[PDB]
Each structure stands twice: as C-alpha cells, then as structure tokens.
Design a binder for this molecule. Structure first.
Ligand SMILES: Fc1ccc([P+](c2ccc(F)cc2)(c2ccc(F)cc2)c2ccc(F)cc2)cc1
Lengths: 102, 102
C-alpha cells in the first residue's frame, strides 16, 4: 500500500495524541505513542524517497485537513458551521492558488 | 500566542539542515535534524492546547508560505500577477479572521 496514506494517517493520529487525554488512554499503551512518532518518521522517509516533496506537500496538506476535519466532527463531535471553518477554507483556497503559480 | 511562529522558525532551521545535508555537508547526523523537527512539533503541541488541530494545520501552511517565499526569493512580492495577489490576500484575511476569533 501507499506510504503516503500511512504517513498522513500517522501524522493525524500522532498529532491528535499530543493534546488528548489528561488520564491514561484506553486501549493504547503510552509507549505506543512513542512507537507512532518513530513510525511517522519511517513512513515520511519512505514517502519522500519516492514522491517529489512539493507535489507531495500539496496532496498532504489537502488530504490532512479534510481527514482531521472528518475526525474532528466524528470522534470529537465538532460542529461544521463554526466561523473558524470558513476562515480555514479561505486559507486553504489561498495556499492552493500560490501552489499553482509557483 | 507566538508558539506557532517559533514552530515555523524550528521548521526553517530543520528544513535548511536537511537541504544542507542532502546538497552540501556529508557530516551531519539525521537525529539532530529530527530533533529540530521535533522542536517544531513541541511548539505545535503547546499551540494545540489553544488552537484546534485542523485550524492549526491551515495557519502553519499559510504562515509558512509567506516566510518561505520571502527567504527563498530574498524579498517579498516581486513578480505577482492578479491571482497571486488574491492568493496572498486570502491567506492573510483568513488568518486575521482566526486571530479575531477567540
Ligand atoms: F501542514 C503541514 C505543515 C508542515 C508539513 P512538512 C513536515 C513537518 C514536520 C516534520 F517533522 C517533517 C515535515 C511535510 C511536507 C511535505 C510532506 F509530504 C510531508 C511533510 C514541511 C517540511 C518542510 C517545509 F519546508 C515545509 C513543510 C506538512 C504539512
């Protein structure tokens, strides 16, 4: 399977685990989070062995924001009609335009 | 919060070290570059206490594009055509909308 899909998913899980849980996580040992950080770098290194960095970055930002928006609504219950989402979308549209002219 | 600004600088130091290692020095450990990127993530983790992860991803890319553009050309805002001007305005305006939001 693609390293890139694993790598984006590893960043989403790993970054989500950064601010999550003042008690100790259900299902998951905390050394698993350390392994996940190591796995994320391994997946990234495989990804940027084979995929050009700037081309990859455009895919990566677009997939990552959507994936964590879906996760934010799904697992954390977050609203889709918050004005911050609109602000984020303006940035997402703007970064896409710069990416096409560079 | 100015932590994401620090995370951007930690990204600039680490990215330059990676590019320096690939193109120029033969004698730089991978672990040091990884620690510089981990510093960007620690500064991000402090940010993720205050700014939601999806919002934080979009701001990191857009704030990145302006600083990286300025450093990589050595000046800001030369050779802008009409959609590029709109692209820069959208990035600034979206971040400003998030900045005004609590
Ligand atoms: F929202 C974002 C913000 C940053 C990145 P980042 C990054 C961050 C932390 C890290 F540990 C290693 C790499 C990147 C760029 C293209 C990819 F395929 C995968 C990752 C990156 C590195 C150098 C650079 F100049 C710009 C971005 C990705 C999405």
């Amino acid at each position: 399977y693609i390293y890139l899909g694993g790598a984006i998913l590893a960043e989403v899980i790993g970054t989500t685990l950064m601010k999550f849980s003042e008690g100790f996580t259900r299902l998951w040992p905390s050394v698993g989070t350390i392994i996940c950080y190591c796995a994320s770098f391994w997946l990234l290194a495989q990804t940027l062995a084979y995929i050009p960095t700037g081309i990859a970055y455009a895919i990566w930002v677009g997939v990552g924001i959507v994936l964590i928006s879906l996760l934010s609504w799904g697992f954390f219950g977050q609203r889709l009609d918050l004005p911050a989402i609109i602000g984020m979308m303006l940035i997402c549209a703007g970064v896409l335009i710069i990416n096409l002219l560079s």
